[PDB]
Amino acid sequence: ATDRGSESDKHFRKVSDKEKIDQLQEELLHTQLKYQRILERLEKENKELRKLVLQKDDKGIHHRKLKKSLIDMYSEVLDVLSDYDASYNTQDHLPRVVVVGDQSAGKTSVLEMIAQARIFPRGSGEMMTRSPVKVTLSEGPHHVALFKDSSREFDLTKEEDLAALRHEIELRMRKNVKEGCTVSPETISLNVKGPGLQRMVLVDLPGVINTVTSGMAPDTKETIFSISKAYMQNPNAIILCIQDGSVDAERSIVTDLVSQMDPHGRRTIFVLTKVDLAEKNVASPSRIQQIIEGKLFPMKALGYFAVVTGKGNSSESIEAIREYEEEFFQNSKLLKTSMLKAHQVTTRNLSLAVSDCFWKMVRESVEQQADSFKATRFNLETEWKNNYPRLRELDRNELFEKAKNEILDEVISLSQVTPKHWEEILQQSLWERVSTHVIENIYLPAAQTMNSGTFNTTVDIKLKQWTDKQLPNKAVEVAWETLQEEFSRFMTEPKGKEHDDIFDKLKEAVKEESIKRHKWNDFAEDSLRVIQHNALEDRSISDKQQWDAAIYFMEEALQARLKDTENAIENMVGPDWKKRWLYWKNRTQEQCVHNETKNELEKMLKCNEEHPAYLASDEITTVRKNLESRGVEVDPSLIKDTWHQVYRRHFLKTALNHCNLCRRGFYYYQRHFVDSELECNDVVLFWRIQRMLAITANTLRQQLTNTEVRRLEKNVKEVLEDFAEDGEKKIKLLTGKRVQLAEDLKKVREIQEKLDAFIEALHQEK
Amino acid sequence: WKMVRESVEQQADSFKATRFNLETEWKNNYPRLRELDRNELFEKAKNEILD
Ligand SMILES: Nc1nc2c(ncn2[C@@H]2O[C@H](COP(=O)(O)OP(=O)(O)O)[C@@H](O)[C@H]2O)c(=O)[nH]1
Ligand code: ALF
Ligand SMILES: [K+]
Ligand SMILES: [Mg+2]
């Protein structure tokens, strides 16, 4: 009878097994223990069956050391790195090839005529590049590129598919840009296969703008510079410097961006675009001869200075661009009358030369990263472990689940609270809430008559009306709060000096959802009304012990009121001579008035001890004249306020003296046959309420332990499952700086594997 | 029929548990009457009154 919710769950839980254990045992334990093992061993077979078919498309199985997915290893390493750390602290050490040049140059053309002319939005009229776009190029058949690493199935040779693919990239480009600028560092990941593509990662960084026009947000050019740090602070970056062939080199921006990155040109190759505009204006090949020699290019870029040319139409196909480029370069005086042989100028030579320089840098520098990340992990683990010796290995998934079980365990522990605590806490809390209402609004005005029948009649009518409207509504609220008060203590209270504060955000977050769903039984009040009516209706106290308990607790309530009034009075009247002379204090003129106003009222009560609480205006006038006769002029309102506090002090002392004789007078045996005027009807009123609330608490406790705590437990389970799925809150709640460090350690460990996997793939040559 | 077959078996356990809890308390408070009915109660009075 102490608790019934736990028994119900066990009974039906066994029933479920009795009917379905022959299916549950296989699914719940046998399958799950083998499930993890088969992931390593049997999924291996299905992965290999498809992988081999995919490798045949790659040709990796057919040809040793030659596989189109071999270059995809390089991108996988960077994809983890960008997710692990997209900031300069990690990005600055990641090898890459970047397209750098004046925005007007159309610098991206170096990549458009390879694969991107079909799927990347282009054309003049507006700035196209909005954020760094990385394209993973690989020798292979035509295949729809990955867009934001998302799979696609499109034909790259038909306009209808390509147009939709151009839309997809544009959406990422603009969405990466936030208010205040037109460019964003947030990168876009593309991976395309097709003929003529080289194994390398080329990034089209947003074009630099000398000045921010009114058509662009003010921070455009500063943002591009910060994005330009992808190479300016990256010793592993290869820079393709694009000179806008429409304008002279002395008008360029790229010269300063790269010359401050590598003034020796060791990390860069200079490329020129739109050279054919030289013949749409008065061509000056003598300036081109300086261009090839790098006289006017401070970065002294190394390699052959390739040139890109195009019809300028934004619909020219990749094949059309290649054919146009070859014919123009092989005949134009810009290159035929200067030392720029077309077979070195052609973009396809740049793609090969860029691919050649790409693998040179990657193999040389990649091994340094493996040592760097390993050193990082050891330094992080040493400090992380020393500050958190308890957690040698931690994850945010492990952190959440521990709380999930811990929370459910505590709420169950809350369900283990004995009724003794519930009944005492509910009874004590509820009575204290309504202890003054009865005294001030029911008892004291009823005490103004000497007719005990009216006294009991008056209160009973008020109580029944009060009972119907207030008592069960306050009682449930106390019970609802009382359960939450213990729940919070069970939930988030520390175990002395040991406490995992890392879990407090989730615990309180779970509570708020669980209390919102904690709807107390809407009919609990109806039972209490019947109970309270019966508890009040039965006023028969035939037991001395019932009398003894009721009177002592009534005294405490009255003594509390007496001190409450007395403390208010002392402030109203101030210190007496004992404290005025002891602490060198004095009275305010109001306190002086109150003391004399008190004295006159005390004298009035000294004789008229039975004076009713209500004062006649003649008494108010009499006091005023009695005080005015001593030089004290008092507003009637002061007297009435003084009167109320002093009267209760007078009354309450009388009531306690009545209580003293009620217990003592009846206690003496020979006095029980003396019918004195000591009808302790207040003890009858107090006793019934004490019993009435005690029964109320028991009804609340029964509902508390039978229905409400189970609803609280059920809601917690519903909320915790929502949190289990709510990754963002789990991240937002689990921010303890050790799980985040543990998360970083995991990512570092993964990168070390990914770094070595690619490095291991480099070592396939020997 | 999906809901009825799934949940109906729970009722059988619930009612059986109800009877055992009711019989335990009912029998303990009324050990004399292991089985009682309002028809048996009336007839006993009928004979008792006539006697
Ligand atoms: N004349 C000429 N036009 C080009 C060349 N490369 C690209 N374009 C034109 O520039 C426009 C878009 O090229 P794109 O590489 O996207 O430059 P961006 O949009 O300014 O970054 C298209 O209309 C192309 O025809 C080139 O080498 N010569
Ligand atoms: F014109 Al650009 F990136 F070269 F928008
Ligand atoms: K442009
Ligand atoms: Mg562009």
Side-chain angles (χ1 to χ4, degrees):
Chain A
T2 183
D3 183 70
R4 284 269 159 268
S6 298
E7 313 303 331
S8 181
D9 184 70
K10 289 184 291 183
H11 173 76
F12 282 106
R13 183 178 298 272
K14 293 177 176 180
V15 170
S16 179
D17 294 358
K18 288 180 177 181
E19 298 294 344
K20 301 292 189 180
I21 185 63
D22 60 329
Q23 309 297 316
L24 295 169
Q25 193 65 38
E26 185 72 358
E27 184 62 14
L28 295 177
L29 182 62
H30 182 70
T31 301
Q32 305 303 321
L33 292 173
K34 275 56 179 178
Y35 173 76
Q36 183 60 44
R37 291 176 170 83
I38 60 171
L39 289 175
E40 186 183 355
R41 286 292 186 270
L42 185 56
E43 299 292 337
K44 187 174 181 293
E45 293 182 356
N46 291 331
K47 292 174 182 180
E48 290 175 357
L49 290 171
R50 179 54 174 178
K51 176 175 178 178
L52 290 163
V53 177
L54 300 170
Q55 285 194 269
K56 175 150 187 174
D57 305 330
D58 311 333
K59 307 256 63 177
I61 49 168
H62 296 270
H63 206 282
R64 301 177 181 178
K65 297 179 284 292
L66 191 289
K67 185 175 60 172
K68 79 183 176 173
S69 60
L70 185 63
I71 171 58
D72 296 64
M73 300 297 296
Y74 180 84
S75 297
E76 290 167 358
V77 176
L78 296 176
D79 298 329
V80 178
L81 285 156
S82 298
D83 309 355
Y84 152 82
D85 183 4
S87 66
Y88 67 95
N89 288 327
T90 305
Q91 295 297 318
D92 287 1
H93 304 280
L94 312 188
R96 67 187 69 186
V97 189
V98 293
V99 179
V100 184
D102 297 358
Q103 184 275 358
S104 58
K107 61 190 193 308
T108 60
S109 62
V110 301
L111 180 54
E112 298 294 333
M113 70 177 293
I114 301 176
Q116 291 304 303
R118 297 173 294 178
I119 59 169
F120 188 73
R122 73 181 200 171
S124 61
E126 63 175 4
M127 177 185 295
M128 291 295 170
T129 311
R130 302 293 169 182
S131 69
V133 182
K134 67 177 189 177
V135 177
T136 306
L137 300 172
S138 187
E139 300 168 356
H142 290 299
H143 191 287
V144 59
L146 299 177
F147 293 75
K148 197 64 175 180
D149 297 328
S150 186
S151 298
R152 294 293 185 270
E153 297 183 358
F154 288 79
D155 186 334
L156 292 181
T157 62
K158 295 183 175 56
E159 173 57 21
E160 292 77 1
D161 291 359
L162 293 175
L165 299 179
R166 293 198 291 275
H167 183 69
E168 291 294 329
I169 301 177
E170 186 174 3
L171 294 171
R172 302 299 186 179
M173 294 158 60
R174 301 183 178 278
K175 287 178 180 184
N176 296 338
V177 178
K178 302 299 177 295
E179 292 73 3
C181 55
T182 64
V183 170
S184 178
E186 186 177 358
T187 69
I188 297 169
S189 174
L190 301 177
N191 183 319
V192 62
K193 275 70 176 301
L197 281 60
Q198 294 296 309
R199 293 180 183 179
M200 60 186 183
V201 179
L202 188 55
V203 184
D204 291 337
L205 299 168
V208 66
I209 46 148
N210 172 264
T211 181
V212 192
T213 60
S214 59
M216 300 175 295
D219 299 330
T220 300
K221 73 181 181 181
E222 297 176 354
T223 305
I224 299 153
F225 182 89
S226 303
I227 296 171
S228 292
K229 292 174 175 290
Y231 61 87
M232 294 188 298
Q233 305 180 178
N234 189 334
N236 296 330
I238 289 167
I239 305 164
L240 310 182
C241 304
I242 306 311
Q243 170 59 42
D244 185 4
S246 66
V247 297
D248 186 70
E250 296 182 359
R251 194 182 181 274
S252 307
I253 305 164
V254 64
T255 53
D256 308 359
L257 293 170
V258 182
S259 62
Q260 301 303 296
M261 182 277 181
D262 184 1
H264 304 278
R266 297 156 178 173
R267 297 294 181 192
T268 174
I269 306 163
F270 170 84
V271 180
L272 187 141
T273 60
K274 303 178 174 180
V275 73
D276 57 331
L277 300 171
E279 289 176 331
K280 293 179 179 179
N281 293 260
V282 181
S284 184
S286 56
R287 293 182 183 174
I288 295 172
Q289 187 55 32
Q290 304 175 359
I291 279 171
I292 182 61
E293 299 181 10
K295 183 178 179 180
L296 295 174
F297 299 131
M299 78 293 288
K300 306 179 179 182
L302 298 181
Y304 186 93
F305 296 177
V307 188
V308 186
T309 187
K311 298 171 180 172
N313 191 341
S314 61
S315 60
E316 194 185 5
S317 61
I318 291 171
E319 295 72 4
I321 297 165
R322 296 174 184 180
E323 293 181 354
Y324 172 91
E325 181 175 59
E326 292 298 347
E327 292 182 354
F328 175 81
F329 287 168
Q330 295 167 18
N331 297 273
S332 180
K333 291 182 179 179
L334 307 170
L335 311 174
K336 296 290 290 182
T337 63
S338 55
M339 298 301 300
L340 295 91
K341 297 182 176 181
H343 68 285
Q344 304 167 327
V345 181
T346 179
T347 300
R348 291 180 295 169
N349 183 41
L350 180 66
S351 181
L352 296 168
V354 167
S355 182
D356 304 325
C357 303
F358 174 80
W359 292 117
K360 172 175 171 59
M361 59 159 192
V362 169
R363 64 197 183 181
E364 294 165 359
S365 302
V366 64
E367 291 181 354
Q368 189 60 35
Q369 307 166 6
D371 310 327
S372 178
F373 269 90
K374 287 184 181 67
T376 302
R377 180 172 59 81
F378 289 112
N379 298 338
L380 291 175
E381 291 176 357
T382 304
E383 187 62 9
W384 174 75
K385 291 175 178 180
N386 295 344
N387 301 331
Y388 317 107
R390 291 179 174 177
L391 300 150
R392 283 287 153 276
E393 295 181 357
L394 175 61
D395 181 65
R396 65 182 181 88
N397 289 337
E398 300 296 341
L399 192 66
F400 170 83
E401 293 304 339
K402 175 181 178 179
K404 184 184 182 184
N405 303 332
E406 176 184 355
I407 294 164
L408 294 170
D409 304 358
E410 288 293 346
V411 66
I412 293 165
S413 305
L414 179 68
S415 178
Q416 303 308 318
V417 175
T418 174
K420 181 180 72 64
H421 303 175
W422 299 117
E423 300 160 353
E424 298 167 359
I425 296 165
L426 297 169
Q427 183 174 338
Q428 184 58 28
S429 172
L430 180 54
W431 173 87
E432 198 197 42
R433 180 177 186 181
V434 303
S435 57
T436 56
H437 164 96
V438 179
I439 294 171
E440 298 298 345
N441 304 324
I442 299 173
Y443 161 68
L444 287 175
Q448 301 300 302
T449 182
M450 299 299 95
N451 183 288
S452 58
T454 302
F455 169 88
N456 298 328
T457 307
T458 303
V459 300
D460 300 357
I461 296 169
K462 295 180 170 181
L463 296 156
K464 293 178 173 181
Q465 306 160 333
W466 176 51
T467 296
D468 181 65
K469 298 173 175 179
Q470 293 295 280
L471 274 175
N473 192 31
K474 302 176 177 300
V476 171
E477 183 183 5
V478 171
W480 192 99
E481 294 304 337
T482 301
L483 180 58
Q484 297 300 333
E485 290 167 345
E486 300 305 339
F487 170 69
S488 306
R489 293 180 173 181
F490 277 98
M491 192 179 66
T492 47
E493 189 183 2
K495 270 62 173 181
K497 297 179 176 180
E498 182 180 3
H499 177 66
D500 283 331
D501 177 84
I502 193 168
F503 300 135
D504 291 337
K505 288 188 174 181
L506 176 64
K507 287 182 174 181
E508 303 170 351
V510 170
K511 177 183 68 173
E512 183 174 5
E513 293 292 340
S514 63
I515 63 184
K516 283 191 298 179
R517 306 173 197 188
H518 177 201
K519 299 173 182 179
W520 197 281
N521 189 315
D522 56 330
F523 295 94
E525 293 177 350
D526 304 353
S527 173
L528 298 177
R529 291 187 187 90
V530 179
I531 292 168
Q532 293 156 342
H533 297 165
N534 306 340
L536 298 169
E537 186 60 17
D538 175 8
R539 65 178 75 92
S540 178
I541 308 176
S542 57
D543 193 332
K544 181 183 182 295
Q545 79 196 238
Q546 293 177 335
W547 286 104
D548 310 329
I551 187 163
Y552 292 119
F553 293 116
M554 198 178 67
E555 289 171 351
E556 301 171 351
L558 299 172
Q559 293 156 347
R561 302 293 78 78
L562 177 58
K563 297 180 172 181
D564 305 328
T565 307
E566 177 54 25
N567 305 333
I569 288 167
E570 183 168 5
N571 301 343
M572 181 177 64
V573 304
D576 190 4
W577 64 263
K578 302 173 178 178
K579 299 181 181 183
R580 293 194 304 270
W581 306 342
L582 174 57
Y583 305 106
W584 299 98
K585 305 296 186 176
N586 289 284
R587 298 173 300 170
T588 68
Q589 59 276 40
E590 303 78 353
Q591 289 177 340
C592 296
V593 169
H594 290 295
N595 186 340
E596 301 306 332
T597 307
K598 169 265 290 185
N599 298 339
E600 296 293 333
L601 298 167
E602 291 295 346
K603 291 184 176 183
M604 178 278 291
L605 292 170
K606 184 177 180 181
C607 301
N608 289 337
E609 299 176 352
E610 297 180 357
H611 191 289
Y614 177 85
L615 294 187
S617 61
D618 310 329
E619 186 61 17
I620 302 299
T621 308
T622 304
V623 172
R624 285 184 299 162
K625 304 180 72 59
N626 300 12
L627 297 169
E628 295 155 9
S629 61
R630 194 163 175 180
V632 181
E633 293 177 350
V634 182
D635 176 302
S637 61
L638 187 155
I639 300 167
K640 296 181 172 181
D641 302 3
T642 308
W643 161 251
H644 288 294
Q645 297 184 358
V646 302
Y647 168 88
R648 292 190 299 268
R649 182 179 63 188
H650 170 71
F651 172 93
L652 294 168
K653 293 181 175 185
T654 306
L656 294 171
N657 302 335
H658 162 86
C659 289
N660 297 342
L661 197 64
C662 281
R663 59 186 180 79
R664 296 181 301 172
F666 288 72
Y667 155 77
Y668 304 116
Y669 69 92
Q670 65 279 28
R671 300 187 182 184
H672 67 239
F673 56 75
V674 182
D675 56 333
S676 58
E677 293 177 350
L678 207 64
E679 296 185 354
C680 325
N681 298 287
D682 51 342
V683 184
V684 177
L685 174 58
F686 189 89
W687 172 87
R688 290 179 293 166
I689 297 166
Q690 292 294 128
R691 181 177 181 170
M692 179 186 67
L693 300 171
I695 306 166
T696 301
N698 307 342
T699 303
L700 297 166
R701 181 271 300 173
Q702 296 159 337
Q703 304 164 357
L704 183 155
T705 58
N706 301 341
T707 302
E708 306 298 349
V709 73
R710 295 176 64 186
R711 295 180 177 183
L712 178 58
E713 293 180 348
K714 180 264 291 178
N715 298 341
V716 168
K717 296 173 174 179
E718 296 181 331
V719 172
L720 284 171
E721 293 297 344
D722 306 356
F723 278 113
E725 299 175 353
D726 187 322
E728 286 188 356
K729 291 186 179 61
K730 291 192 297 182
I731 297 168
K732 292 171 180 182
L733 300 163
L734 303 179
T735 62
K737 306 172 168 181
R738 65 191 190 183
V739 65
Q740 304 166 279
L741 288 171
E743 183 179 4
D744 303 356
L745 290 170
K746 184 186 70 175
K747 296 171 170 179
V748 169
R749 291 179 181 182
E750 297 163 354
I751 290 166
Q752 294 166 8
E753 298 176 349
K754 298 294 295 186
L755 289 168
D756 303 353
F758 169 81
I759 298 159
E760 181 176 3
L762 287 174
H763 297 178
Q764 305 299 304
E765 186 67 10
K766 300 177 179 180
Chain B
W1 292 117
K2 172 175 171 59
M3 59 159 192
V4 169
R5 64 197 183 181
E6 294 165 359
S7 302
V8 64
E9 291 181 354
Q10 293 177 335
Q11 307 166 6
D13 310 327
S14 178
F15 269 90
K16 287 184 181 67
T18 302
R19 180 172 59 81
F20 289 112
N21 298 338
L22 291 175
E23 291 176 357
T24 304
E25 187 62 9
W26 174 75
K27 291 175 178 180
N28 295 344
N29 301 331
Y30 317 107
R32 291 179 174 177
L33 300 149
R34 283 287 153 276
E35 295 181 357
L36 175 61
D37 181 65
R38 65 182 181 88
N39 289 337
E40 300 296 341
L41 192 66
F42 170 84
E43 293 304 339
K44 175 181 178 179
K46 184 184 182 184
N47 303 332
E48 176 184 355
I49 294 164
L50 294 170
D51 304 358

